[PDB]
Structures are given as structure tokens and as C-alpha cells.
């Protein structure tokens, strides 16, 4: 429910960062200029986020 006895902050090893991620961002495009839809594997990719 809402039991959070303590709260820890620690350095994030590279392995941890991959675990959090749901994918990889591989292109610098942001959104298409006509459909105004997030582009594939881009910074707004619908597959990843």
C-alpha cells in the first residue's frame, strides 16, 4: 500500500540503466513533419516509451 520505511540513493551501474530501459533510442528524429506522429525508433518512438 503506502509502506516506504526508508529510501536509498546509489550510483547506477551501466547494467542497471539497461534494466530500467524498455528499449534503445537510435535516431535523432522527433516527430514526422506531416502526420505529426512520433517516428520509428526515434526520440519519441511509440514502441519504446
Amino acid at each position: 500500500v503506502n509502506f516506504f520505511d526508508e529510501l536509498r540513493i546509489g550510483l547506477a551501474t551501466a547494467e542497471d540503466i539497461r534494466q530500467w530501459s524498455y528499449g534503445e533510442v537510435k535516431k535523432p528524429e522527433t516527430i514526422n513533419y506531416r502526420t505529426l506522429k512520433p517516428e520509428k525508433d526515434g526520440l519519441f518512438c511509440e514502441k519504446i516509451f
Binding site: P28, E29, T30, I31, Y33
Partner: protein, 299 residues
Amino acid sequence: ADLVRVYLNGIGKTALLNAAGEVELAKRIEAGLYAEHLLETRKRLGENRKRDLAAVVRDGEAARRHLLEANLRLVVSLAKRYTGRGMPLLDLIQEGNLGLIRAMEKFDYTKGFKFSTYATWWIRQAITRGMADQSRTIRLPVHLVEQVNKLARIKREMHQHLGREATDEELAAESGIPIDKINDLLEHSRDPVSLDMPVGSEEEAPLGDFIEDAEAMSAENAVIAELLHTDIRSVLATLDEREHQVIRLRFGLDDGQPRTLDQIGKLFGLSRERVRQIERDVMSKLRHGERADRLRSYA
């Protein structure tokens, strides 16, 4: 600091190349490429010549590096002129360096022309392509980028001649572009505003704070979607089953692709004129009985 300065010293480390040096290096690198080509075709591979061929390959690679290092200065001399156009100077230099390697990959010394003349065109090409693809956060097609630059240059020249800013119609006459196309092109030219910019100094509140989500009512969407979709499916089921298939195909409730009157007639073997009457029957049926009671809403 000053990452530009450290790179500038690095490129200045290598001295310039003369015409005699350029041709000598060009011959050496060509031999190295030819030697590397010979590696994969010498089926009866020699023993000592194999080591000699490998040594020449290293020599050719060394010549390639030395030629590139010397020629980096041309790239900087060409990249300097494009600064201040939404791309960092050092980023432009790296894009030009990509152009340099690309040009060197296709360089030929048999024509007797200096490497600078042939490289300049490629360096130019690479830098301008880079700028077009990267300089804008919302990547526009290269075609649009070229058209925008054309309009901007024309607008500057026309304004200088007129002495006053020109309208879309006047620009269209000068540039031979449709007026609506110019309006759309101008809108594309806009560089998006930043949300972090404080607005009206309203308690140092960024513009993004005032943006209204005003969307994403998931609870409302789910109930409406469930009710309407289920109601129509059940109502279509109560109708003739073949007509239910007709609605699915005529429309695409399952697979999209709304079948036209002739097309659906072809699939069912009927004529193009029968579909209108079929739809007339469906609409008439849907407006009577319990179907109306269920579907009176949703309008």
C-alpha cells in the same frame, strides 16, 4: 577548455602538402589499394611477396592518414563560412571531415588537378547535407530545406529592390511558387519556441507550466468505446448475418479497406447498383425496433 582551440592546434601540427607531395601520396595510396585488391585474388599466394604486399598495404594506409591530416585545413576553411546557422562550428567541421574522407575515397590523380579543387565540392556537399538534416529539431526533408533557402534568398533580394517587405503574391511572382505553397513553406521555416522561456515574467513561470493537458480521459474513453462498439456489433448481429458481413466489408470493421459498391458486388457476385438498395434496407432496419432504443444516443 576551448575544444575548438585544441583541435585547431592538432590540425596545425601537420604541415601543408605540395603538388609533388600530393601526386606522390596519391600514387602510394593507389598502389596500396591495388595491393589490398590483389590480396583476395592471389589464389596461388606467394610467400615473400605476401609480406611485401602487406607492407605496401600498411604504407598505403599510412599515406591515406597523412593526406587526410594535411587536408583537414581545407575543411575548416570551408566550414567556417556556415557558422551561426543553427549548427555549432565544431559540429560543422566534423561534418566536413566526413565529406573529406568521402571525397578522398573517390579521388583520382590521373587528371592532374589539385586535390583541393575536387575536394571543395564534396566538402561543400557534405556540410550542406549535414546542416539540412540536423540543424532543425523537427527534421524536414532536404527538398523543403532547399526550397526554404531559395525563398529566404529571394525575399532578401526583392526587399532590397522594393525597399519594403513584399507580400506572398509578390514573392510568388518573383520565385514562381504558388502562393499557398509559400504560406506553408514559411510556416515550416519557423523555429519552434522553447517551453522553458519565462512568459511575461509571471512569477518566473516557464511557458510550459501554463500548457493545458486537456486530454487523456481514459476512463471516459473506455466506457464509450465499450458501449458503442458492442452496441453496433450486437445490432449488426440482429440484422441479416450476410448483411453484417456486407457492413464489415463495405466498411472494414475488421480489416479496414471499405469496399466500394462495385468492389463489394464483385466479392459477393452482385452488381454495383444493388449495394445502394442494400444500404437503404440496412439503414431502414437500424432505425426501427430495439436497435433504435439502443442507438438513439452516441450522436
